[PDB]
Scaffold this active site. Sequence first.
Site, short mmCIF file in Angstrom:
data_model
loop_
_atom_site.label_atom_id
_atom_site.label_comp_id
_atom_site.label_asym_id
_atom_site.label_seq_id
_atom_site.Cartn_x
_atom_site.Cartn_y
_atom_site.Cartn_z
N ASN A 1 52.02 9.48 37.88
CA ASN A 1 52.62 8.72 39.17
C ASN A 1 54.25 9.28 38.89
OD1 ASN A 1 52.74 5.77 40.30
ND2 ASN A 1 52.87 7.96 41.80
N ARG B 1 54.08 14.40 41.22
CA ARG B 1 53.59 15.08 42.20
C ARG B 1 53.32 13.76 43.01
NH1 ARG B 1 48.77 17.81 38.60
NH2 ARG B 1 49.33 16.60 37.25
N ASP C 1 51.51 20.59 37.79
CA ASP C 1 51.90 19.43 36.98
C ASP C 1 53.57 20.50 37.37
OD1 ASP C 1 53.10 17.90 35.77
OD2 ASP C 1 52.31 16.97 33.86
#
Length: 153
Positions: A11, A14, A125
């Site tokens: 968190n 993205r 990611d």
Amino acid sequence: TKSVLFVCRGNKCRSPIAEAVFRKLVTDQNISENWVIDSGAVSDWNVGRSPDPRAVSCLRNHGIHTAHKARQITKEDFATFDYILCMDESNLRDLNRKSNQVKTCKAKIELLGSYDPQKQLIIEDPYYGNDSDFETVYQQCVRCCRAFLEKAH
């Protein structure tokens, strides 16, 4: 009132971008008052941290700002959000399993990329990438968030 929670690993890259993008979207569409929007992490490791500086710079390049601080998803999130939209299969697998362990799951768990009209299913990611990878994620979130707002599935 509709609700969406964007989830990724930590968190910080993205899901903070998706949250800010969707918040920008509903605001431009003048329906932000009828939407609860948030982002959270599967892991607790990065809790309390601001978004990655490269995510902040990416959003700023597009006239967007976020004051989000990383938080971990909670049992309550499964009971109150209409949709939990995650980024990669690792997120989906983890979220589906914890969804099983809550007796009060109202949220539908889906890949955010499942809404990409361009069919890129995974939002990878970008942390170990570079700033162009954050731009890619941003562009993915724009296309997916707009498709999601038009029709959910």
